[PDB]
Ligand binder design. Structure first.
Ligand code: GDP
Length: 1343
C-alpha cells in the first residue's frame, strides 16, 4: 500500500523483500546509502525510479523487465559491488536513465535482445566493461554516453552510429589509439572527454584546438577532402590606370598587343606555377565608367587578393585617390590582402621611393602602426611595373604567388582541405552557369534551384542546412557563387548598366519600366525575382501608385535649427541614394521590442504637405514646419570641401525632423559608403559634423563637443565670446528632447536614483541597465543608458548612438497605453534614462503537480498575455523575446483586474505566437532547445492529468511547426472570451457499459455497471485523477437499477426487487439482502444514524432506518395513493392517481422534509411522523416531475427547483411556503442571457444540478444552462449567467445523465447508440467564479 519507500542511512544488509512485495502501490523505491547485499526480488508496483546506489549489491535478478518494464525510468545502481549485469535490466521499455558506474562489470549482454528503446542516458564509466558492442537503436534515443575508465582498446564501432549524442566521454582508456572518422558525423555532440587517449589519426594541432576541431577534422576526412588551390583575385583602381593592361601582362608575359575594349567587368581563369606548387585565380577585372564607382563595391568579397592599380607618373593626386579604394576594400573585405601595384613605370628612381613613402603614409598612422579602417599595406605589398619593357613583371608574378600562399584562414588558402562534396557542388554550379549562358537564360539562381543542384549532384554528401551554407561560403570565396544567389557577375553588371542607360521626374510607371527592361530578356515569370534585386541595389525602388523611382533620373535644381556636414569627398551617386531613401521613407510616413537592432523611423510622424526632391536636395513643407537639405560648399579652418546644409523650422519647437535626416545619413553612410565612416591616417574624420553658432550671428561648433557636453551639462560658451554662453537646446535640440509633451519629463529633484548593483533589476536588449529607484516616493524601474582626439571621437560617436536609441525607445514606449503593457512614467536627459512602472512581484519565470498557480489565475494570466500580444500586433510591433523572464507578475490575487504586464526587460507574428505557446507550456507545467527547430516539442501530460483540455489544445497549436497553422493573438483573445474555454476540464472514454451511477463520496465517485448474470461487472472512474481504479471487475448477480452510498456501505437495488448491501474495505460479497414489494426506481438518504428512503416503481415509498450504514431488514411503507384519497380528496378516476413511479426525491428544510415526485404532482414527507402532509401541483397530467433539488446556498431563502418531462419546464417553489414563485421554459433555442421573474429533442432538459449558488440544467443537446438569481429594484429575478457547450463531445452521442461528483466538479455522462459511454468533466463554478471570469474581460475592455 506504501507509495514511497525511503530506507537509507540505516542497518540494511538483508531486506524483508517478502514484506516489500505487498507494496504494490510503490512509485519510488529508494534503498540507497546502505550495505544492501540482496536487492528485493522485483514485484508488481509502478515504480517511476529505482535508487539502489551506494550499497554492497553484487548482482541483480533477471526480473526488472518482468514487472517494471512499463513503469521504471530512472535507475541508478552506481557505486556498488556489482559484478554482472542482468539482460532484463536492458529489457525495460520505460527505462530512460541508467547508471551502472563504479563497479566490476566486465561485459554487457547481447545487443539484439535489448528493449529499452527510450534509453537517453547511459553511464558505464569506472568499470571493467569491454571492446563493447552497443545496440544500433540507441542512436535514436541516447543523448549522454560515458565510458570513462572502461576495458576498451578502441572506440566502440557503434559509437559512430549514435547520431543523437550531446556528450561522449571515453577518457582514461589508454588502449584506445584511434578516433574513427565516422565520429565526425556526430553533429549534435559538443561535450567530449578524450583525455588520456592516443589519437594517431588526428594532428596534434587539431587536438590542441579542441574536440570540436577534432570532429570537424574527422568530418573533413570522411568527405574525402582535397587540397584546393583556387582563390579569388580582383583588379580595382581609378579608371584608365592600366588594369586590363596589367592583367594582360600578368597572364601573357609579353608586351600587350590586344587590350580589352570598354567593359564593366571581365572574368578569366589565370594559372601560375611556383617561381601545392601552383595556384589558380578566378580573376575579376573590375572597371567600367565613373558611374559604376559605388556600384562595383558590391562585388568585393572577403579572403580574396585585391590589386589596386595605380598610375605612378600621374602624381600625388593618384596616391590621394587610392585612399577611396583602400577604404572600400577594407570596409567590404576585412580579412583580404591588398597589394598596390604601380603602372607607367616607363614614365619615371628616387621618385619611386617618394611615392612609396606617400602610400605608406596613407596606410599607417603617424605612430607607424596600421591605421584604423585601412588595409595592411607594407613594403612587401608594394610593386611597380611598366607596360612595354615589362620591368618587374617576373617580380610582380613572384609577389602574387608569394602573397597567395601566405594568406590563411586554418592553414594557407592555397592548398586548404575542402570537402569533396563542396568541389562537386562547385562543378555543378559552374555547369549550371555555363548551360544558362548557352541558353541565354537568367543567370540569377534561386535558393530552391541551388538545393536541387546540390541534391541532384551524384554522391554529394551535403544533406543539411549547415553543410550547404558552408559550401555556399566556399563558393563565394572562389568567385563561383554570388550573394547580396547569382552565378554571373558580368550578367548582373550588364543588367544594372542597361538600367543606368535609361533616359517623368525620376518616377516611371511599372508597366513602362517593364517594357523598358526587355533588353536583358526580363522574363515576366521571373519579374518578382528581377525587381527584387533592383530594390537591393536601390536602382529602381517601388513607390506610390505602383510606380518605380529611378534615382539616376532625379530632376535638377528647380524658430529654426541648422546643421552642416563637411565631406572631404562626395561618393558618386551619394545624393541620388540619399534623396531616394529619404523620399521613400517620407512617402511611407505620409518595429521591435525588448531591444534589438531592428527598428523603423518611428521618430518622425507629421503630415507631408509639399515635397520638392531634386538631384542634390530635398525640401519638405509639413504642417507647422519645414525640413530642407541641400548641397553646398563648406569652408572650415581654411579647408574647402563639399557639404550638406540641413535646416529645420518648427513652430512648436518640435525638431524631431532633424533626427529623420541625421539617422538616415548615418544609415546610408553605414550601408553604401563605408568610406565616410573612417578617419584619415592622422585621425582627421572624412565626414565631420558642425552646428552654426546662433549667438555668434561663420562660427561652427564641432558636433562632437556639443554631444559630449550634452551628457552632463546644458551650456557651451563659444570661443569668440566665452562670457555669453549658449544652451545646447539651441544647438542640438534633437538630443535634448523637445517634441515630447512637457508632462513626460521627470524631475531630477523628485527622483531618488542611484546606479547601485543591489538595485539592479536587469538589463535590456539595447545595452541599458534597469535599476530599482523611487519617483515621488513610489517605487519605479529606472532604465539607465551608459556611454586624445581618438578617444573623444569614439565617445562622441557612442553618445550620439545612445541619444538616437533613447529617442527611438521613447517614441515606441510613448505609443503603448494598453493595460497589460508596462507603461512609461517619464524621461530625463541628465542622466539619460527612462522611468517605468515597477512590478510588486518578480517575473513569471520566478513565481512559477499541474497548473501550479491554480486554474482561475492561470486562465487570467493567459488571457492577459494574449490581449497584450494582440495590442502589440495591432501596433505593428513584434515582441521578439516573449519569454516568461520578460512577463512581470503584478499580483497573484484572482480578484484584481490586472495580474501581469508585458515588459521589455527581465520574425513576424508567428514567432511571437510560438513563444507564447512555450509560455503556455510553462504555465501548465511549471518548468521550461535547439531540438525545437527539428520538430521536437516539450512533453506535457495527457488531458486526463492536466485537466484543462482547451488551453492545452491551444498550447499545442501555438507550438505547431508550420507557422501557417498557428493562431493569431486576436483569435486567441476572442476564443478565450467564452466560459466554455475556462470551465471544461477534459473528457474520459469509459467505453461499452450499461448503466451509470454516482454517490456523494469519493470511494465510489462514478460507477458504471455492465454485463448480465454471471458476467455482471462494474467500472470505477476517479474523476479527480482522470484514472479508472477498477475496470470491469466482475461481480455476478442481477443487474442494478439504483445505487446509493450511506456511511461506508453501498446499497444497490436490482431488478428482482432486492436491495443488496456491500460494505467497502471490491463489491464481491454482499452482507445484507432486503426484500421489497416493487422495483426500486430511486434512492435518497435523509441525515437523521440515517433514514434511507427508496422510491419504488408503484409510487410507494419504503423507509429504512440505518444504524452506521447497516439497516433493519424491516421497513415502513408510505403509500402515495392513500394520501391522495384520504388527505387531499383526490378521486380514483383522477389522472393524479395513475400508477406513476417515484422518479426523484430530495431533502428540504434541513432534513425535516423530503419532497418526492408523483406524476405531475409533488408530495412532501414530513420526517417527524413519516406521513404525506403536503401536495403541490407544479404541472398538469400527463406530465411528470423528473428531478428535484434543494438550492440551499447563499444568504437567502431556501428554494426547491423542479424540471419536467413533457412541457420541458422548470419551476421553483419556496421550501417554507409551498408557493409556486417562479416558472421558466428551458427549451429555448438561444437561451443565453434570458430572464424570468420571481414573485415572493436536443432542447429537452435532462436533470437539474445544484452547483454551489447556481442551477445547471444540462440538455440532451450537450450544452448546459447555468441559471442564477439576482435582485432588481427589490424584485428577485433569474437569469441565464452562461451557456456551456464543449464541442469536443459532439461526436460522442447524446447526453444521458449528469451529476455533481465533488465540490468543484460536474460530470455530464454521454451515451452513443453503440452503447459506449463518455464522461465530460466541467469545473463547478458558482456565482462568484462566473462573475470574476466575466469581469476579467469586461474591466480590461473598460480599461
Ligand atoms: N605609358 C603607359 N601607358 C599605359 C600603361 N598602362 C596603361 N597604359 C595606357 O592605358 C590604355 C589602356 O588602359 P586600360 O587598361 O583599359 O585602363 P582600364 O580601363 O582602367 O582597365 C592603353 O592605351 C595604354 O596606352 C603604362 O604602364 N604606361
Amino acid at each position: 500500500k506504501l507509495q514511497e519507500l525511503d530506507i537509507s542511512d540505516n542497518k540494511l544488509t538483508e531486506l524483508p523483500a517478502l514484506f516489500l512485495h505487498s507494496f504494490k502501490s510503490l512509485n519510488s523505491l529508494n534503498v540507497s546509502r546502505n550495505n544492501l547485499k540482496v536487492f528485493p526480488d522485483p514485484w508488481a508496483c509502478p515504480l517511476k525510479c529505482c535508487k539502489a546506489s551506494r550499497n554492497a549489491l553484487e548482482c541483480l535478478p533477471d526480473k526488472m523487465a518482468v514487472f517494471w518494464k512499463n513503469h521504471l525510468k530512472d535507475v541508478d545502481f552506481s557505486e556498488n559491488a556489482l559484478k554482472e549485469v542482468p539482460l532484463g535490466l536492458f529489457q525495460l521499455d520505460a527505462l530512460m536513465f541508467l547508471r551502472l558506474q563504479g563497479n566490476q562489470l566486465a561485459a554487457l549482454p547481447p545487443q539484439e535482445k535489448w528493449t529499452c528503446r527510450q534509453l537517453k542516458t547511459l553511464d558505464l564509466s569506472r568499470n571493467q566493461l569491454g571492446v563493447l558492442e552497443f545496440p544500433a537503436f540507441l542512436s535514436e534515443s541516447l543523448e549522454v554516453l560515458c565510458l570513462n575508465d572502461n576495458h576498451l582498446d578502441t572506440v566502440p564501432p557503434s559509437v559512430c552510429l549514435l547520431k543523437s549524442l550531446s556528450e561522449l566521454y571515453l577518457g582514461n582508456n589508454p588502449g584506445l589509439r584511434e578516433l574513427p572518422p565516422e565520429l565526425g558525423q556526430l553533429g549534435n555532440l559538443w561535450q567530449l572527454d578524450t583525455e588520456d587517449l592516443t589519437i594517431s589519426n588526428v594532428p596534434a594541432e587539431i587536438q590542441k584546438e579542441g574536440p570540436k576541431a577534432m570532429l570537424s577534422y574527422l568530418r573533413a576526412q570522411l568527405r574525402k577532402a582535397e587540397k584546393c588551390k583556387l582563390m579569388k583575385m580582383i583588379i580595382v583602381g581609378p579608371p584608365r590606370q592600366g588594369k586590363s593592361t596589367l592583367l594582360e601582362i600578368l597572364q601573357t608575359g609579353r608586351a600587350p598587343q590586344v587590350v580589352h575594349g570598354e567593359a564593366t567587368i571581365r572574368t578569366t581563369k589565370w594559372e601560375l606555377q611556383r617561381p601545392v606548387e601552383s595556384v589558380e585565380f578566378n580573376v575579376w577585372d573590375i572597371g567600367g565608367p565613373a558611374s559604376m564607382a559605388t556600384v562595383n563595391q558590391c562585388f568585393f568579397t572577403d579572403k580574396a587578393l585585391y590589386v589596386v592599380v595605380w598610375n605612378l607618373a600621374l602624381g600625388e593626386e593618384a596616391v590621394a585617390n587610392l585612399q577611396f579604394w583602400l577604404l572600400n576594400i577594407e570596409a567590404k573585405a576585412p580579412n583580404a590582402v591588398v597589394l598596390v601595384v604601380g603602372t607607367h613605370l616607363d614614365l619615371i628612381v628616387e621618385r619611386i621611393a617618394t611615392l612609396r613613402a606617400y602610400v605608406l603614409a596613407l596606410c599607417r598612422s603617424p605612430s607607424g602602426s596600421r591605421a584604423t579602417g585601412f588595409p595592411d599595406i607594407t613594403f612587401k605589398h608594394l610593386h611597380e611595373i611598366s607596360c612595354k619593357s615589362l620591368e618587374g613583371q617576373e617580380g610582380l608574378r613572384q609577389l602574387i604567388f608569394h602573397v597567395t600562399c601566405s594568406m590563411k584562414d586554418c592553414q594557407r588558402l592555397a592548398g586548404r582541405l575542402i570537402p569533396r562534396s563542396y568541389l562537386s557542388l562547385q562543378e555543378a554550379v559552374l555547369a549550371e552557369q555555363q548551360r544558362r549562358s548557352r541558353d541565354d537564360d537568367v543567370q540569377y539562381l534561386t535558393d530552391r534551384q541551388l538545393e536541387q543542384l546540390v541534391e541532384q549532384t551524384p554522391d554529394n554528401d551535403i544533406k543539411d542546412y549547415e553543410d550547404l551554407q558552408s559550401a555556399i561560403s566556399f563558393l563565394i570565396e572562389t568567385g563561383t557563387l554570388l550573394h547580396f544567389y547569382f552565378l554571373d557577375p558580368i550578367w548582373l553588371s550588364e543588367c544594372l548598366q542597361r538600367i543606368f542607360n535609361i533616359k517623368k521626374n525620376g518616377v516611371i510607371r511599372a508597366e513602362d519600366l517593364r517594357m523598358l527592361l526587355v533588353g536583358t530578356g526580363f522574363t515576366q515569370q521571373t519579374e518578382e525575382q528581377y525587381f527584387q534585386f533592383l530594390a537591393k541595389f536601390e536602382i529602381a525602388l517601388p513607390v506610390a501608385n505602383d510606380s518605380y523611382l529611378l534615382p539616376h533620373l532625379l530632376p535638377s535644381k528647380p524658430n529654426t535649427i541648422q546643421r552642416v556636414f563637411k565631406m572631404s569627398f562626395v561618393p558618386v551617386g551619394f545624393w541620388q541614394r540619399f534623396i531616394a531613401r529619404m523620399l521613400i521613407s517620407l512617402a511611407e510616413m505620409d518595429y521591435s521590442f525588448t531591444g534589438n537592432q531592428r527598428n523603423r523611423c518611428s521618430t518622425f510622424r507629421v503630415k507631408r504637405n509639399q515635397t520638392i526632391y531634386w538631384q542634390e536636395g530635398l525640401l519638405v513643407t509639413f504642417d507647422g514646419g519645414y525640413l530642407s537639405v541641400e548641397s553646398s560648399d563648406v569652408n572650415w579652418k581654411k579647408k574647402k570641401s563639399g557639404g550638406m546644409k540641413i535646416v529645420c523650422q518648427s513652430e512648436v519647437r518640435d525638431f524631431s525632423a532633424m533626427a529623420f535626416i541625421t539617422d538616415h545619413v548615418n544609415s546610408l553612410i553605414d550601408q553604401w559608403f563605408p568610406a565616410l565612416t573612417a578617419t584619415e591616417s592622422d585621425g582627421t574624420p572624412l565626414m565631420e559634423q558642425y552646428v552654426p553658432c546662433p549667438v555668434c550671428e561663420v562660427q561652427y561648433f564641432d558636433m562632437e563637443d556639443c554631444v559630449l557636453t550634452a551628457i552632463e551639462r546644458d551650456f557651451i560658451s563659444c570661443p569668440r565670446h566665452p562670457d555669453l554662453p549658449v544652451p545646447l537646446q539651441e544647438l542640438v535640440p534633437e538630443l535634448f528632447m523637445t517634441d515630447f509633451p512637457a508632462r513626460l519629463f521627470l524631475e531630477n529633484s523628485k527622483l531618488e536614483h542611484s546606479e547601485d548593483e543591489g538595485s539592479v533589476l536587469g538589463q535590456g536588449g539595447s545595452g541599458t541597465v534597469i535599476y530599482r529607484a523611487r519617483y515621488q516616493g513610489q517605487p519605479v524601474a529606472v532604465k539607465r543608458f551608459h556611454i586624445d582626439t581618438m578617444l573623444r571621437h569614439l565617445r562622441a560617436t557612442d553618445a550620439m548612438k545612445n541619444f538616437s536609441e533613447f529617442r527611438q525607445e521613447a517614441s515606441m514606449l510613448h505609443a503603448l497605453q494598453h493595460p497589460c503593457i508596462v507603461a512609461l512614467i517619464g524621461i530625463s536627459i541628465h542622466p539619460l534614462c527612462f522611468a517605468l512602472e515597477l512590478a510588486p512581484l518578480s517575473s513569471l519565470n520566478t513565481v512559477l503537480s499541474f497548473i501550479p498557480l491554480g486554474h482561475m489565475l492561470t486562465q487570467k494570466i493567459a488571457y492577459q498575455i494574449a490581449s497584450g500580444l494582440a495590442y502589440l500586433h495591432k501596433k505593428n510591433i513584434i515582441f521578439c523575446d516573449l519569454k516568461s523572464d520578460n512577463i512581470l507578475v503584478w499580483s497573484l490575487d484572482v480578484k484584481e483586474h490586472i495580474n501581469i504586464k508585458l515588459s521589455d526587460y527581465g520574425y513576424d507574428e508567428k514567432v511571437d505566437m510560438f513563444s507564447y505557446g512555450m509560455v503556455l507550456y510553462e504555465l501548465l507545467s511549471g518548468q521550461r532547445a535547439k531540438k525545437l527547430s527539428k520538430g521536437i516539442r516539450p512533453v506535457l501530460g495527457q488531458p486526463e492529468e492536466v485537466q484543462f483540455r482547451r488551453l492545452q489544445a491551444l498550447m499545442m497549436e501555438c507550438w505547431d511547426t508550420k507557422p501557417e497553422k498557428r493562431p493569431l493573438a486576436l483569435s486567441v483573445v476572442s476564443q478565450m472570451k467564452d466560459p466554455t474555454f475556462a470551465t471544461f476540464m477534459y473528457e474520459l472514454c469509459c467505453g461499452k457499459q450499461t448503466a451509470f451511477f454516482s454517490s456523494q463520496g469519493q470511494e465510489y465517485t462514478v460507477v458504471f455497471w455492465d454485463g448480465k448474470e454471471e458476467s455482471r461487472n462494474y467500472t470505477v472512474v476517479n474523476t479527480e485523477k482522470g484514472l479508472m481504479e477498477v475496470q470491469r471487475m466482475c461481480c455476478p448477480g442481477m443487474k442494478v437499477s439504483c445505487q446509493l452510498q450511506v456511511q461506508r456501505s453501498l446499497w444497490t437495488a436490482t431488478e428482482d426487487q432486492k436491495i443488496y448491501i456491500y460494505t467497502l474495505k471490491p463489491l464481491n460479497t454482499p452482507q445484507q439482502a432486503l426484500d421489497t414489494p416493487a422495483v426500486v426506481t430511486c434512492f435518497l438518504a435523509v441525515p437523521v444514524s440515517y433514514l434511507v428512503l427508496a422510491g419504488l416503481a408503484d409510487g410507494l415509498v419504503a423507509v429504512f432506518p440505518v444504524v452506521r450504514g447497516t439497516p433493519k431488514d424491516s421497513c415502513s411503507y408510505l403509500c402515495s395513493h392513500t394520501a391522495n384519497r384520504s388527505k387531499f380528496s383526490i378521486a380514483d378516476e383522477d389522472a393524479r392517481q395513475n400508477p406513476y413511479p417515484v422518479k426523484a426525491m430530495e431533502v428540504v428544510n434541513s432534513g425535516s422534509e423530503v419532497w418526492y415526485s408523483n406524476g405531475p404532482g409533488l408530495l412532501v414527507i414530513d420526517c417527524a411522523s413519516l406521513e404525506i402532509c403536503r401536495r403541490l401541483e407544479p404541472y398538469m397530467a400527463p406530465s411528470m416531475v423528473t428531478s428535484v433539488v434543494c438550492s440551499s446556498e447563499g444568504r437567502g431563502e431556501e428554494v426547491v427547483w423542479c424540471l419536467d418531462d413533457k412541457a420541458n419546464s422548470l419551476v421553483m417553489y419556496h421550501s417554507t411556503t409551498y408557493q409556486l414563485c417562479a416558472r421558466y421554459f428551458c427549451g429555448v433555442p438561444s437561451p443565453l442571457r434570458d430572464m424570468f421573474p420571481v414573485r415572493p429533442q436536443h432542447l429537452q432538459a435532462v436533470k437539474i444540478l445544484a452547483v454551489r449558488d447556481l442551477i445547471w440544467v444540462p440538455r440532451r443537446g450537450g450544452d448546459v444552462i447555468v441559471i442564477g438569481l439576482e435582485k432588481d429594484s427589490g424584485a428577485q429575478r433569474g437569469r441565464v449567467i452562461a451557456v456551456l457547450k464543449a464541442r469536443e463531445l459532439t461526436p460522442h452521442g447524446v447526453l444521458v445523465d449528469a451529476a455533481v461528483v465533488a465540490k468543484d466538479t460536474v460530470v455530464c455522462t454521454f451515451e452513443n447508440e453503440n452503447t459506449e459511454w463518455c464522461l465530460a468533466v466541467w469545473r463547478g463554478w458558482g456565482a462568484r467564479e462566473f462573475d470574476i471570469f466575466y469581469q476579467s474581460y469586461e474591466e480590461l475592455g473598460r480599461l
